[PDB]
Write a structure and sequence with these properties.
Structural class of chain A: little secondary structure
Largest sheet of chain B: 3 strands, antiparallel
Organism (chain A): Pseudomonas phage JBD30
Radius of gyration of chain A: 32 Å
Oligomer: part of a larger assembly
Protein name (chain A): Bacteriophage Mu GpT domain-containing protein
Largest interface: B-C, 86 and 98 residues
Strand content of chain B: 5-15%
Helix content of chain B: 40-55%
Number of strands of chain B: 11
Keywords: bacteriophage JBD30, virion, capsid, connector, portal, adaptor, stopper, viral protein
PDB class: viral protein
Protein name (chains B, C): Portal protein
Strand order of the largest sheet of chain B: 3-2-7
Number of helices of chain A: 1
Shape of chain B: flat
Helix content of chain A: under 10%
Structural class of chain B: alpha+beta
Order of helices and strands of chain B: HHHEHHHEEEEEEHEHEEHHEHH
Shape of chain A: rod-shaped
């Protein structure tokens, strides 16, 4: 951000501005479930398929 | 029931079939066109033949987006249909009740918002080989209404393992899910005889697209290399690393820099960078574009353009061969699909009785071709003075002028 | 309520929705077109597919600004619509009350300033895929009025995480903010079937733009290098730094300077600078421009120009195929959007009762095509002398002449 507007007497100070660059990487996430192919069809109540 | 005879239950019409499949709505296209090679394309097509339509659908979408010529051709072809006037006609020698049913259906379609969007969504099946539009059914008292039309991506479906012509939803099960009756408007235009997977036009257009893509990318690379020549610097034994770096920077900037000085013991050789022409690339692009134009719109007006030339019969010359045939085919197929899917549920839900399926009203597109008024108006008086009794109905129908009321 | 059935509350109409989002009005475009590479463009498009429309919108704006050919094509296409006469018509076989409502709406639209600007702002959705115009509602006593129309940048919106077809404001929250009913006129023309992110024409036109940009920049660089040859000076061992600098300055200025002298122990070699032609670059630019013309306005009049040639049927030949289809499609979509968004709030706020949505008046653009007066005027007398009773209403409507009052 800019420096505060100061008083003026004889000359102007050519101020500067800082910078605070922030670094952060990325991470990967996963969740998986192993199921039997035959079992999903081998059901009558409509369960083990929506899972 | 429906046209196919499957039992119809009004209980399932309250909610869309895909509502209980919230997983589908959260998916994102995988963009299989990026980094595509001929082997990858062949594998994609072969896998699609076996019931894996997701990759094929995504590839077709990418192909449509990334090719300007193909996109323009397809858009022009579809807009040709979208601009045709349409009407609902009663069956052959229909009775008063049938005429009333047809009139009511016509009035309902006129006042049904989103018809143009429905036609546009259905016409996607021309390139994709099949388009599925989900229906929202609502009751405004005692009469069922299509609340809205939702176009579902072709990547949401698959092939039945026991049937290669029957589509099913992807519900995480090997066999998918059968399509709900009265819940979809499936449009499957048939350019070539075969199964649904092989029936898309983009399957024909894929290879020219890849040829054009490769040619354009190679031309862009060659244009990037063009300009300055590659120049190699040579240094003698006993040149330190700092001097090596200085020589390397000098060589790197020498092309932009007009002048430079080196010791007599060093040497710089300017070798050819890329010398040739754009002729081969452009030839390949033109070949592919001509192939696409012929496949989409015919090789009489687009690729081998019909050129200029007016006249009374110029309309017929431009249209009847190729353009009229394609227009009529597409319009008739779309009309058949609509009459099968949208008109029938309205007739069998919004009206009493069980009318026979063969007598259902059929949606008809106006394919009338503008006839030369002046020549024919010159012709009639001679014929009528001769003695021929030409019916006025034929004249009024062919000219487009309506009969007096 | 609105056409979609969402409840409507007149309390929220006093202030714009974005008024409480003063942060948006202070933002500046990031200009993502500068330093754009094919990888960056692919990343931008893919991210836009996932709900990050800010970068895509800014890129599209830069693309529109930086390409003269594309800008000219888009401006011509939009000005085609802006010049069409329009009228408000009552629904099918409307009653006296409906006719009065339609007449009042027509009078209100005629006297509503800023209509042309509204149409221009809405037509931006053709290229951007969606255009949002905020409404200012005011009460001049008992009747609501649209005070002004404000076009908000496409960079101000995003996609719903739970719905890829529903747009939302950027309010610093992950889910954004739902669009206020009756507070916007959203225009989303549909050139291709798909989601809102993929529906823009600039998505199709992006790659030819990048090809043309690369070709033009490379040609400019090669023209800069053209002229004098690169010449390298060589000096023997025992040449001091001052003599090295003198030789370097001599070589640097030798191209401009016709003559110079060096010791026999030194050497200057004039090497090829850049030898070739503009043919490859210009070929690429022409290819890209033709692709853009075909994608925007069709490959019958712009890219593959229809050439000259007059005649009575010349208007039809130039228009009906391609130009008429595109004009009708754009006009119909714009009219549907307007009838949905602007006409309905006026009808349901400025008039009593709750008219049914299906019977709302519809804005219609005048797509009538100029018909040859001379040929048809020759034709009628023969037909009428034959005995045909052609209605006068058809003649008056088709010729553009109004019926006597």
């Amino acid at each position: 951000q800019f420096p505060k507007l100061r008083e003026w007497i004889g000359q102007r100070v050519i101020k500067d501005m800082a910078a605070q660059g922030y670094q952060i990487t990325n991470k990967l996430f996963e969740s998986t479930v192993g199921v039997k192919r035959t079992d999903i069809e081998d059901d009558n109540l409509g369960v083990y398929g929506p899972l | 029931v429906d046209v196919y005879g499957n039992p119809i239950r009004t209980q399932q019409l309250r909610e869309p079939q895909t509502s209980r499949l919230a997983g589908l709505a959260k998916e994102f296209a995988q963009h299989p066109a990026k980094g595509l090679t001929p082997a990858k394309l062949a594998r994609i097509l072969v896998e699609a033949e076996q019931g894996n339509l997701q990759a094929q659908a995504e590839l077709f979408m990418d192909m449509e987006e990334r090719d300007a010529h193909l996109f323009a051709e397809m858009s022009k072809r579809k807009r040709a249909i979208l601009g045709l006037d349409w009407a609902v006609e009663p069956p052959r020698n229909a009775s008063a009740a049938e005429k009333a049913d047809a009139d009511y259906l016509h009035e309902l379609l006129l006042d049904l918002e989103g018809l143009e969007d429905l036609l546009l969504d259905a016409l996607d099946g021309i390139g994709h080989g099949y388009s599925c539009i989900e229906l929202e059914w609502a009751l405004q008292g005692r009469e069922w209404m299509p609340l809205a039309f939702h176009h579902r991506p072709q990547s949401w479906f698959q092939l039945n393992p026991e049937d290669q012509n029957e589509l099913r939803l992807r519900d995480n099960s090997p066999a998918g899910e059968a399509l709900q009756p009265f819940g979809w408007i499936i449009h499957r235009p048939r350019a070539r005889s075969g199964y649904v997977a092989r029936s898309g036009l983009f399957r024909v257009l894929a290879w020219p697209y890849l040829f054009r893509h490769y040619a354009t990318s190679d031309l862009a690379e060659m244009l990037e290399i063009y300009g300055l020549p590659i120049r190699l610097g040579k240094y003698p034994p006993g040149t330190a690393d700092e001097e090596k770096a200085t020589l390397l920077r000098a060589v790197t900037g020498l092309g932009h820099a007009a002048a430079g000085i080196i010791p007599e013991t060093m040497a710089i050789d300017f070798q050819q960078a890329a010398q040739g022409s754009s002729d081969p690339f452009l030839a390949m692009m033109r070949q592919s574009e001509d192939a696409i134009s012929k496949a989409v719109l015919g090789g009489t007006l687009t690729s081998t353009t019909s050129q200029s030339g007016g006249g009374a019969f110029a309309l017929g010359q431009v249209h009847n061969e190729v353009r009229h045939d394609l227009l009529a085919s597409d319009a008739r197929q779309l009309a058949a699909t609509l009459s099968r899917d949208l008109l029938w549920p309205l007739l069998v839900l919004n009206r009493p009785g069980s009318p026979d399926v063969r007598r259902a009203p059929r949606l008809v597109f106006d394919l009338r071709e503008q006839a030369d008024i002046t020549s024919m108006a010159q012709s009639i008086p001679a014929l009528v003075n001769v003695g021929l009794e030409i019916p006025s109905a034929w004249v009024y129908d062919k000219l487009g002028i309506p009969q007096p009321a």
